[PDB]
Amino acid sequence: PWELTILHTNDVHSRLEQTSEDSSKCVDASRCMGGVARLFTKVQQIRRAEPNVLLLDAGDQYQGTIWFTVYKGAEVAHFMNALRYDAMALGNHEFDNGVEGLIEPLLKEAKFPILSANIKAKGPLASQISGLYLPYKVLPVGDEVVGIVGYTSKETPFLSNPGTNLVFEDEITALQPEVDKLKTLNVNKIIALGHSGFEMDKLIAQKVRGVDVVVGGHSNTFLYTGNPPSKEVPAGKYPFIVTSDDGRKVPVVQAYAFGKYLGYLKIEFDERGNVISSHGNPILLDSSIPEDPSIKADINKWRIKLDDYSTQELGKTIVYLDGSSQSCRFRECNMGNLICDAMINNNLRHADEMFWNHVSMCILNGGGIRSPIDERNDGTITWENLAAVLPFGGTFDLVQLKGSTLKKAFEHSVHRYGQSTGEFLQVGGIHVVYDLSRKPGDRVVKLDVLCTACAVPSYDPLKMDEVYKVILPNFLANGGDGFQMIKDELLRHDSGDQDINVVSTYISKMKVIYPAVEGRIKFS
Amino acid sequence: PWELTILHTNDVHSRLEQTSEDSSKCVDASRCMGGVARLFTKVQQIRRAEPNVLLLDAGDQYQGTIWFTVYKGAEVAHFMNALRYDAMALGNHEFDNGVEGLIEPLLKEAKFPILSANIKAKGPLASQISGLYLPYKVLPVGDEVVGIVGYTSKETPFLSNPGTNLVFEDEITALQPEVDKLKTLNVNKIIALGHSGFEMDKLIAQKVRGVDVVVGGHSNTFLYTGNPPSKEVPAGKYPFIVTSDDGRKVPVVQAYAFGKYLGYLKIEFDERGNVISSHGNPILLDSSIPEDPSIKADINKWRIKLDDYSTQELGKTIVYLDGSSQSCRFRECNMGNLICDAMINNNLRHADEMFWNHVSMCILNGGGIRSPIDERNDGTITWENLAAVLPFGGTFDLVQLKGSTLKKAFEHSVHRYGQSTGEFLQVGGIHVVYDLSRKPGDRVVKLDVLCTACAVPSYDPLKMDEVYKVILPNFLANGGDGFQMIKDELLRHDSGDQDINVVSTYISKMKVIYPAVEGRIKFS
Ligand SMILES: Nc1ncnc2c1ncn2[C@@H]1O[C@H](CO)[C@@H](O)[C@H]1O
Ligand SMILES: Nc1ncnc2c1ncn2[C@@H]1O[C@H](CO)[C@@H](O)[C@H]1O
Ligand SMILES: [Ca+2]
Ligand SMILES: [Ca+2]
Ligand SMILES: [Cl-]
Ligand SMILES: [Cl-]
Ligand SMILES: [Zn+2]
Ligand SMILES: [Zn+2]
Ligand SMILES: [Zn+2]
Ligand SMILES: [Zn+2]
């Protein structure tokens, strides 16, 4: 049998430097994990041991820390080139700076192929981008060849800024003829590498005839066989085996997110390219593995410009930005309005006919706002200032919530009001009125929401059965601050941009800000 | 006696082309008035008749039409040079594009001296601007000399964007030593030329010893001796004679605004430079006076770039901009919110310690909103589109109103509600609640206003005795749409920027707009 070792990452999300255990900023360096210098060491070790190795990335390198803010994808090309990745699929966040912000920093500088079979370019863009990403690449590995066919979430236009000259096709429809064709060209070993989420990966494994292994991303899915090595709870075994329509067993793998783990799957193939076995597990990149000194020095050198950036003026406020807990855990606070307005602004996406935008509504727990910003230094606002307000390494995510779930969330916001607890919600696109004399769970007396499927945005009463799009912190999507109803009742949850970056981009765009407290939240 | 003819303009406000009788856009060319080509003809005629002539401008050439929008003061230098002005005082609107927007287009290109004795530069700006404007200029006229000493409203920092490196001193304090000095240098004929308003001009005439004539501006004051030639109602005789503290009779003159009239004052002086007589009257620049063909051709040539500009994209809307009367004369409409938000944004000025900004509140009659803007052409918004919404050639002005006056204005807004009448008010920085079941004059049941002397903008109940700053159309400041209480009770009224330009600048800054109807106005 011919044995291949597939190493893979996904949803690394700009975690170029080692992180704490929960993927936030590293504080105690001796206990940190991940980062590209540590990944380099482990990949180099495995390449000395294993004759036939592919290192694959399943997309979403872009977006997540100050690295992406400042270097805009140049750091992705540079460090993935240093790690000698063999191929990468395009993720939704590769479109965050538009097509131009994908072509120039990443597609033109990567030394490895960048893949997606289900993205079609139209208009003048087609000739500009032709060949810069590919539907597939056939790679030599030893005396053999392996075809790698790429795919990208069809939901990308709702999640990122791909423009209107890219069309995202159904993955299975796009994939099948490419896999068909490779088989006719005597490529008998096929890896589907792409960025649509575990549920779609399993459908691809089941329905795309000839795929031998699926390497996926997007859903930050952690799979593990045995007792897991850290805090992530496995969604299933690694690999996760799908029985295909043609009767084969097809391994599906993913490796969580943030560069914390290196996926590692060993596959034996027979001479006709059929998988005869598959085994592996993601490797926790913990502090027992040394950071490669050369990569780490390079990281340190690139960090200088980040340190410079962190104190540079982004824009100005002419008002006090009240992110105090005495305000934000008790009433509407202007820092909460500012952050919710930034959240909506970041989520302006190309709209279908019937919508002005697909989302209008925002909630933000007041316990997530960790500092004011005063008017010292002539109202200058810096990245460092915003990092004190939003210090947790969160993202502002898109969820779908029934109106009845949102009503429960607003009851939870005030269920024990008066104690300075974190669950009190700041809002955008929502007007709520509380009567604190009523029993807990019966305190919300009016709840109006800004329409989306309207030509003129305006407020209507919340409807219990309607499913609303809402932007909120990943902490809340995950049921943080007692918002268990959000986690247990949501219909869809997509991970969005870095919290600090959402706000910094908004301030930079606005230039001079003056957020008011304007009656989005009232009592009585 | 030595006889001097002083010709003067003030507050021309970008009316380079002939206008209708009310100074708005010319429609019927055979009935139009003013414009620089017609002014040229009249000035040339008077210079053939009168040996000793000065042509003076008292400031506020900048701001008022698409000319200023596109040419940013280059048109002012070019056309005032063509008319061979002898001197100009700086007005408040000369600072609308900051100090940089004054130095480069106007101060460096004017062929005549530009004056202000009461503006002092500090910091690095002092050496950058030194000599580009002057406190005074001594001009030869025949065998004689005449000193011209300049002044500018001390309120300029509240009205325009002069920055923080210019200090506006008390006019009388600044003027006196310059006039003192000229007298010691055997300059015995002194004209004070400046831009502080008729009330200050009269104080300068009374108190600045040695001033022989005051030529003023800023208040758009029309003075006339006899039956007036058009619709402007005279505030007093021309000249208006002040008895000075030293016992002399000192003529004060002004010539309305918009280039409609050419001031014309004949002064006889004795050999010691004392005024022995003064007589004159502004000349209505009506269609009996031909437009000079060469100036008019030059105007036509400069107009090409304006015509190009008028259809160019300023920014984009992703919402329908509802400026329909069925919306704006009956309820809150998003086009009214947009325009009020632009009005406040344009009036962000350097703030004293206690304020986030000096003004937060806006009212706009719904009858002043004359068109929607739909989402045809991918949401593009052009100057031409905005000219359909705001077609009257108005400005958005700053007034001071007691709370009791504003309450009356909101009662007037709904006194005959239901008929689609123009007086219904759109708002910013104000939240009003009407109960239309109550008698007319008793329909306002809640009226909250956004604070200014606060670190965090927030709403408090309107107070009847407090005097509020409000931005509103000149039409309302003048008592239009039955708002007689505004005209009769206001404490201060300053003329602001062109209505269309306020909105175009705001849209260009915001790039993509999505104004909502958000409950600024409610019923019941
Ligand atoms: N990761 C996080 N993201 C946002 N908010 C958080 C996070 N962790 C803790 N908090 C907030 O901090 C409060 C405790 O100070 C909690 O009530 C919660 O509101
Ligand atoms: N010069 C103007 N500026 C603003 N609004 C005006 C002007 N002239 C008329 N209107 C408005 O038009 C309405 C009549 O259509 C009036 O009720 C008033 O609201
Ligand atoms: Ca195979
Ligand atoms: Ca004299
Ligand atoms: Cl999924
Ligand atoms: Cl005055
Ligand atoms: Zn991701
Ligand atoms: Zn993704
Ligand atoms: Zn003026
Ligand atoms: Zn003025």
UniProtKB/Swiss-Prot annotation, chains A, B:
Binding-site residues for IMP, renumbered to this chain: 329, 365, 370, 392, 475, 481
Residues that, per the record, bind AMP: 329, 365, 370, 392, 475, 481
Glycosylation, residue list: 28, 286, 308, 378
Gene3D superfamilies referenced in this protein's UniProt entry, alphabetically: 3.60.21.10, 5'-Nucleotidase, C-terminal domain
Disulfide pattern: 26-32, 328-333, 340-362, 451-454
Residues with site note (Transition state stabilizer): 93, 96
SUPFAM superfamilies: 5'-nucleotidase (syn. UDP-sugar hydrolase), C-terminal domain, Metallo-dependent phosphatases
GO aspect biological process, one term: calcium ion homeostasis
Subunit-structure text: Homodimer.
Protein name: 5'-nucleotidase
Organism: Homo sapiens
Gene: NT5E
